[PDB]
Amino acid sequence: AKLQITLTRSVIGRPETQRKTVEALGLKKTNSSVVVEDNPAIRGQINKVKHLVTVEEK
Amino acid sequence: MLLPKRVKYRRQHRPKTTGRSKGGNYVTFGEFGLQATTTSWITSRQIESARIAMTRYMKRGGKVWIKIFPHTPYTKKPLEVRMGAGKGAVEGWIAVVKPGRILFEVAGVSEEVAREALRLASHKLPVKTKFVKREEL
């Protein structure tokens, strides 16, 4: 039901659209994390930045 | 030397050389063929030299199809000139050859004779080639 997302890779050197998706996910600094409700929009954001984040199920 | 009798535009962008051969990847007119395995421009002079080698080795007894034609002009600047001041004049004509394309086909001779004629032609070309037969099944 809930997803924990951790920003595992830096946004330095990443395209601005990927940075914008990182910010819209609520992630702030490297290794910061958010807990969000699982739904297709959140899944799409995660899919866009999957190389930069780690997802686990709560 | 093969070249178009006329073109609409004599000054053309050079063609893209990445990717694989769009078509002409099969022997359709003759019995044996020479298939390119690497990419290069092929010039009309190279085509003429290869054709002469082939026809000389088979004594003009079989028959050859040149499957490529040099449709594309390319320009070259005059010697010792700086950059700019417009595009240079036409220097020659090239055909784009990519892996898979059949360059020449031959018919009317034995397999060994065709193989030797095609080896002699291949040594005149800026690409690596392979002897091929018509594909069945």
Partner: protein, 90 residues
């Protein structure tokens, strides 16, 4: 005159198709439409036996459909059959 085809279940990714063709199988479709795969060597032997427009008894799963070769995709580089279509003769 006989050849066993293994049914491909679900979607196969591009990696799956590459691994199949490396292991030596040819993907094919029988036409309900069925996605199958065969062995290239055994297919070559059956085609040699029966001719290009011959008749084959394709063992799809448990059944046995009398099919021919409607079309085939080939790779002139590497000399490899890459896809087969089997039309049920009816």
């Amino acid at each position: 005159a006989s050849l066993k085809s293994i049914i491909r279940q679900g979607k196969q990714t591009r990696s799956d198709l590459k691994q199949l063709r490396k292991s030596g199988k040819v993907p094919a479709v029988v036409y309900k439409n069925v996605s199958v795969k065969v062995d290239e060597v055994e297919f070559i032997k059956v085609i040699r036996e029966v001719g290009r427009n011959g008749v084959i008894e394709l063992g799809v799963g448990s059944k046995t459909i009398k099919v021919m070769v409607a079309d085939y995709q080939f790779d002139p580089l590497k000399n490899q059959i890459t896809h087969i279509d089997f039309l049920a003769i009816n």
